Structure formats: structure tokens, C-alpha cells
Design a protein around this ligand. Structure first.
Ligand SMILES: Nc1nc2c(c(=O)[nH]1)N=C(CNc1ccc(C(=O)O)cc1)CN2
Ligand SMILES: Nc1nc2c(c(=O)[nH]1)N=C(CNc1ccc(C(=O)O)cc1)CN2
Ligand SMILES: Nc1ccc(C(=O)O)cc1
Ligand SMILES: [Cl-]
Ligand SMILES: [Mg+2]
Lengths: 268, 261
């Protein structure tokens, strides 16, 4: 099927909604709203990773997420922790989160023993930065080759340390995580099924509100809802297993139309 | 045909004063419409009927302005007196939810250059909540167009003036599945008649059955259905909101470009 991650940024400067859900009550309120609007999982991010973002200590990330995890765990709301800091990831594992979402793709082998002892699923993201986004360009050649080579090595490293293959979800990266050229993001949005087929693992895409959509439409920062929906539905039609989005309700409505079209056309 | 997607922007007088109807028309063109579909009345399931005189009075000053602006106009009316008035003002299209069933009007249609949006409905008129006939809805639509294209071209209306609209929503009956079949299968009409197809899904009630939000905003479901229709080959889309559609089409065009270019 398709699992929707609803983005809740507990940050002062996330690129499209910084500050909004900084207070734990604001983040909790948004998380519950997003679940009612169609999210299946709340992707909780205590620090921005956009190009102009500023990092914070793991102590601060934990202080930002701790009351929110308390509430969502009591609420029975599944949580993915969007953090690249191993100390924050370790805290989340001790609270029993459903997923870890690492924009660095779990590159720290010293943390692998702790990853292996947990049941949490792991969203392993590829980036050309191997970290916080920036505006460099992607390597020359076929971007899908570069992404597959990354996942080949990182999956072998993770599974070699006792993280079971079926815990893994693959995110090829999107937007500035793929470099400054919108063509690179469009290639990955068009061709991520090559990753699903090669690795026989689910794929997660996060196109929501990313800058390459503004470049295609000629539009300003708060004007990218329609382009986002079109890109998300194209990802769904391409077979995406997870979509991480700021606005699950338009996505849910669009998926309802596409699913009903599919069922209606079936000859069985 | 090769022509790229043409968007009809909906301006329904029902209340728009003419200055407001003119303003919304210009707005829709700025947002991505190619043609303004101007409707003086309402053909919802529940909207009251006005006289042909009232329809003409409502559109006359709006046509004045849109004509002066060089804005192509499709007149959405099923009343032949209103259609005759619009033809005499040289509109680009007539859009008839009855599909031009009145053969007494065919000589006047034959003498105009205007293109004709010929819509199918299970009512043969204003939308209601009856359900569809037994059998494949696509067969009933094809049979309707077989007969009506033959009738229109038989009266001297040249075939290439015709745009086919299979109907949508309550024009197809109360079941959402009937609209979904048509939205999924309308290309069958394109290839059977070698004529372009127009679809109008915008804000129709079957999309509400899928949002679960009843009377609430249905722009997202509308966009999804419109993009599916564009991807499925629709030649025209009639919509309330061209701008999100143009944005979505820009994403698909940029994606398409990667598949080959
Ligand atoms: N799994 C996963 N997690 C994320 C992602 C993402 O793409 N996938 N993006 C995030 C947002 N950071 C940005 C990066 C690039 C851009 C941009 O290109 O506009 C915006 C935001 C953060 N967390
Ligand atoms: N060519 C063309 N013209 C129209 C159409 C339409 O579907 N095609 N729909 C119209 C609106 N009438 C409605 C019918 C049904 C529904 C509904 O199902 O909700 C809503 C509105 C009027 N004008
Ligand atoms: N509720 C609706 C009212 C009008 C129309 C339309 O003119 O297409 C569609 C839906
Ligand atoms: Cl099938
Ligand atoms: Mg974030």
C-alpha cells in the first residue's frame, strides 16, 4: 500500500514551517491534526537539515522531542524520529519509536550495536552531502547508479552488523540532497522504481515543498502545494511505499481518487 | 490531435455582477485558462431555471468586455435562443449540457464557425440524481455520440467543429463508480470518433464521496482527477481553478521531459 509520514518540525528554522511546532504543545497539536488528516506516522524532526539550517546539540534535540514522544506514545500515534545525531537516535530507541529517519543513512558504525538491538525500522536516506543539505551539484553520470552504489554498501554494512534487512526503508534523497539541479530530483522521482526492484526493499520519497518544485512552476515559497501534490501522486503511481509530507490531507484525497480509478478499471 | 491541453475556466454568473464576472474571467485567463466558459444559469442537481431573456441579459455586457479583451469565450447554455444570441456575437464555442438535441436549431448551427462542445448525459438535460442505464456506460455514451454526431454532421455541421464531453458526476447517475469509469476510459471515445474530448470533474459531488469531507473543499481531489485525465489524453479540461492544474501539469511535463529528454 502506501504509508504517509506527516512532517512535524520542532525547530526554529525548518524551511517551510520553522517555529510553528517548536513548543511541545504546538507540536503535539499538529501531530494529532496530521493523523486525523491522513498521516499514518508522525515524522518528528527536532532540527532542520535544509541548506540554511543551523544545528543544535543532541541535548536540545532530546529536550524538544521528549514531551512530544510522551504524548504521541500515550496517544498510540506511531513516530519516526528525523534526526541524524546518534545520541538523539539512542534516546528515541529507548522510548520505543517505530522508525528512525536519518538523512545521513546511519553512517556511524560505532552506533550499529545499538541499532541492532532495537526493533525500530530505519529510513536510510541517500544524499550527495552525506549530511545537512547544501547547493553543490550532483556527481556526473547516472544518479541512479550513484544511489544504488550507496545503498549497496550501506545495506551490507548495516546487515553485517546485525540490523535485519527487513527493518530497512530506502530514501534516495530529494531536492538539494541530490544537488542544485532540478533535473536530478526529477530523475529520481521518475526512476526510483529501479531501486525497489534492485533491492526488493520499500522506498520512501519526500518531495514536499522542496525548492526544485518552485523552479519548475516559477512560483514563490508558499505557492507549492499544487506542485507538491502532483509530484506526490506521480511518486504514488510510480510505486512509492512511503511518502513524507507536510500536508497529508490533499495527498490522502488524491490517493483516494487514484485508488478508486485503479479499482474501477480492474478487470479482475 | 496534436494540440496541447486546452483549459476552460468556469465563470458562472450565479451572484456575479458583470464587472465581477469580467474580473473573474480576466483572473482565470491570467491563472492559465485558454477559454472562459461563461454560464449564465445553473445546471447543478439543484438549481432553478431562468428564461432565455435572463440568460442573454446576464451575458451581454460580459461578452462585450471579453470580446474587447480578445478572450475566447465558450457559452455554457442549453437554451437555443441563448445559443443563437451567442453565435450572433461570434463566441468561440457553444457548450451544451444537452448536446444540441434540437434539430430545428441545426441550420443556425451550420451557418456558424463556432466549435460545439457536445455533452452526453443520462438525463438528456439538467443534472439530476437518477442512476445510469443498464450495461456499460461507455456503450451508452458511444451510442449517444454515434447518433448525435450523425445528426449534427447530417445537417451540415462540419465534423471538425465537434468536441465530445462524455458527461461527469450526476450527469452519469448517482453512483461515483460511473464517473470513475468514464474518467478512466474516456480515451475510448477519442479513438472511436477521432474527435477531441473535454472533461469537467471540478468540484463534482463524486469527488466528495472520496474525500469523506462532504461539503468541504475538494480542490485536491479535483486536481488529482484532472491530472489523471490530462495524463490519460484529455484534450480539454473545464475547471474552476486553472492555476493548480497548470502547476501540476508543469510537474508532469518536467517529468515527461526526463523520460525522453
Ligand atoms: N527521509 C527524509 N528526510 C528528510 C528529507 C527527505 O527528503 N527525506 N528532507 C528534509 C528536509 N531538508 C530539506 C532538504 C532539501 C530541501 C530543498 O531542496 O528544498 C528542503 C529541505 C528533512 N528530512
Ligand atoms: N461541458 C460541460 N459543461 C458543464 C458541465 C460538464 O460536466 N461539462 N458541468 C456543469 C455543472 N453541472 C453539474 C453537474 C453535476 C454535478 C455533480 O455531479 O455534482 C455538479 C455540477 C455545467 N457545465
Ligand atoms: N457544485 C458545482 C457547481 C457548478 C459546477 C460547474 O459549473 O461545473 C460544478 C460543481
Ligand atoms: Cl486487472
Ligand atoms: Mg524537518
Amino acid at each position: 500500500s502506501l504509508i504517509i509520514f506527516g512532517i512535524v518540525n520542532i525547530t526554529s528554522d525548518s524551511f517551510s514551517d520553522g517555529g510553528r511546532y517548536l513548543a511541545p504543545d504546538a507540536a503535539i497539536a499538529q501531530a494529532r491534526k496530521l493523523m486525523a488528516e491522513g498521516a499514518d506516522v508522525i515524522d518528528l524532526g527536532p532540527a532542520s537539515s535544509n541548506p540554511d539550517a543551523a544545528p543544535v546539540s543532541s541535548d536540545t534535540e532530546i529536550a524538544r522531542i521528549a514531551p512530544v514522544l510522551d504524548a504521541l506514545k500515550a496517544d498510540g500515534i506511531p513516530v519516526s524520529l528525523d534526526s541524524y545525531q546518534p545520541a538523539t537516535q539512542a534516546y528515541a530507541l529507548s522510548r520505543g519509536v517505530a522508525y528512525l529517519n536519518d538523512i545521513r543513512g546511519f553512517p556511524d558504525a560505532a552506533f550499529y550495536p545499538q541499532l541492532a538491538k532495537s526493533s525500530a525500522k530505519l529510513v536510510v536516506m541517500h544524499s550527495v552531502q552525506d549530511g545537512q543539505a547544501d547547493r553543490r551539484e550532483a556527481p556526473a553520470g547516472d544518479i541512479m547508479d550513484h544511489i544504488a552504489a550507496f545503498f549497496d554498501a550501506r545495506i551490507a554494512a548495516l546487515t553485517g552488523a546485525g540490523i535485519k534487512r527487513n527493518r530497512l526503508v530506502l530514501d534516495p534523497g530529494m531536492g538539494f540532497f541530490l544537488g542544485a539541479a532540478p533535473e536530478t530530483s526529477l530523475s529520481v522521482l521518475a526512476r526510483f522504481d529501479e531501486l525497489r526492484l534492485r533491492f526488493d526493499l520499500p522506498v520512501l520519497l519526500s518531495v514536499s515543498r522542496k525548492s526544485f518544485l518552485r523552479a519548475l512552476t516559477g512560483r514563490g515559497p508558499g505557492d507549492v502545494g499544487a506542485a507538491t501534490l502532483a509530484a506526490e501522486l506521480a511518486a504514488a503511481a510510480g510505486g512509492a511505499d512511503f511518502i513524507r509530507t507536510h500536508e497529508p490531507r490533499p495527498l490522502r484525497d488524491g490517493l483516494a481518487v487514484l485508488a478508486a480509478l485503479k479499482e474501477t478499471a480492474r478487470i479482475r
